[model samples]
Target: INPVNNRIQDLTERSDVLRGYLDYDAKKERLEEVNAELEQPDVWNEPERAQALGKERSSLEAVVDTLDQMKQGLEDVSGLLELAVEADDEETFNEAVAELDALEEKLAQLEFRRMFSGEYDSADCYLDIQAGSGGTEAQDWASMLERMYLRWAESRGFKTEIIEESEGEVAGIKSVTIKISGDYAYGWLRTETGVHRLVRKSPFDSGGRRHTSFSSAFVYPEVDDDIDIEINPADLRIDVYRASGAGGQHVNRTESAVRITHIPTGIVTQCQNDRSQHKNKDQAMKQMKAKLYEVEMQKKNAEKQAMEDNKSDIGWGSQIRSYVLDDSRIKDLRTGVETRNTQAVLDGSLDQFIEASLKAGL
Candidate 1:
């Protein structure tokens, strides 16, 4: 007779459990802490620090406020169910059930953020792709991967800039580095760190033949004002060369591109987006610094598979995911996510794979 109310009670209890695990109370406490920090008389002396604190406070406030709203909505729905039962109104009972369903979906979305509690999870990221050892096919796949990511970012209204790009010997790109700027850029893209395999009939082949190609995608947090990385000049080797463009177009008479080699770790980074050689070199150094920071961070954590290690064996056993055009499927190996909309995936519907990986807390 009271199944709807019983269901509402069950949902509310479960939501309360999720709130406890998320430390919703602790977030409110942190909001108070940031507010206290803001009230300090000398807070304005360090404008940057104050601004950072303000941003943190705002984010925490948002979460706490949303939680409060959810709780109130739950109670209001419970009241509605009681009213419906008293009046014996089946329509009102059904409406309350629909509202409960929507709230459950919201709670599900909220639960997803639990996996993103990393140090730099909210920071913007540097996403880079490299063609694997499979020659022309691999290069083309790398280019496609780059476009996929760019389109994904665009769909989310994120800003992106190409930091460096190397022309392929034949058709696509040998390597490309891009900066995707938005909230949670690093956290969302980090799961995409490894080799991606694409199987399809080769357009380059004289005859139709299915080909398997590999590409490596690496995502790392950008250096923010809070992160200070030091680089010694002695360990650096800087080279300048003409910038390579698509199909050998925009070949420069002046050597404007800059490449930097961090001799200690054999880490290399380059930039050629700017026409000014000086500007290009500055950008290259920035990219190298961010990458080296990532390396050091990985070393501190003792993760054996760093970005440099990802470049090797970008095929077969190393692949974290695969796209099979012949089968009309794309799957993430780590998350066991599969989709038949191969074209949609290439067109930037990557949230399914990303959400699965995040849900698995990978």
Candidate 2:
């Protein structure tokens, strides 16, 4: 009986460990094959690439989900066997109970896969935040939003790189740009962008007036190599400017900061936060490509709808969430998820928000 338990445990561990290696190789190979398939004429209709993407996503998801289910099954069975062993009827079955305890700890690794949707889910992401109005107070709110996101990412054990920050003339940032580096960072953050309006009593105002502040956030997927979207040089208006911080040393006297303007789309991307012109250029270019890729992708996949889109569309049917500090309430209009944790939210507690959106009956 002990021998059987040992064998099953060994085999399960080997299968899972080696399955990871195999899946990694398979993903790399699949990406290459997809690239080649895309090069073929009339490739959009090609079954190979489509099937590759679909099958890969399905298989990877199945692997993780099955692992979870297996772990749960192991728990359920072991629980029953514990009672059996306690009754002195099946002491050998207790082995599974001990092993599943260990397996539960290992389940943490697979939680990352639950939120995958796009090809860049594994890639890092750039997050853009800007204040819409309200002057210095709005800038302060923007800074608060920046801190909220940073703290949230830190809580998740993700790395962040500050790409840009424009401190307001008074006390806070007029804008802040951050690079969140982690697995599925792009796809996860994509759902968070757009008009985030806050209604609360203003701390900046001594008159005790209720002030409404708007912070616009943009999430762009960070890509390694090219993202397959080409921008015409003619469509770009590149400008270089000298970098300046809030009362900092005048290092790099040259106009190292690069700003690119997409003429046709009227989308502008600027990188002044990075020290090197080359690094700034590369970062800015990647963001431009990612944005451009999204533009072209929606055009191509306009008819396509993810299962997650069963709810109202923010881009269309007023998909908006309101966080009201006035009533100590936070409500996601489309998902109908609401909470009343004012202090937790201001301190960058958004796990409830994420969970609500994720579990919005998609």
| Winning candidate number (lDDT) | 1
Residues 1-362 of candidate 1: C-alpha lDDT, one tens digit per residue:
57766776777787787778868889999988999999988998987689678657755764687678779889989889889888999999889888888776666656666788888886778888999999999999999999899999997656899988886889899999998876567887888888999999999999889999999998878674567666899999999887765544354655588999999989888888887889888878877887887777766665555466445422223578999999999999888999999999998989899889898877
C-alpha lDDT values of all predictions: 0.81, 0.68
Residue range 4-102, candidate 2, lDDT tens digits: 446446646754664574475565566566556556667558554564454345444445445656546654655666566667765556655566555
User: Number of clashing residue pairs in every model?
Assistant: 0, 1
In model 2, the runs with Cα more than 4 Å from the true position are: 1-115, 224-226, 252-255, 305-319
Q: What is the Å distance of residue 154 in model 1 from its true position?
A: 3.1
Model 2 C-alpha lDDT versus the unseen true structure = 0.68
- Residue pairs with colliding backbones in model 1 are none
**Candidate 1, poorest ten consecutive residues by summed lDDT:** 309-318
The window of 10 residues in a row where model 2 has the poorest summed lDDT is: 310-319
The TM-score that candidate 1 achieves is 0.71
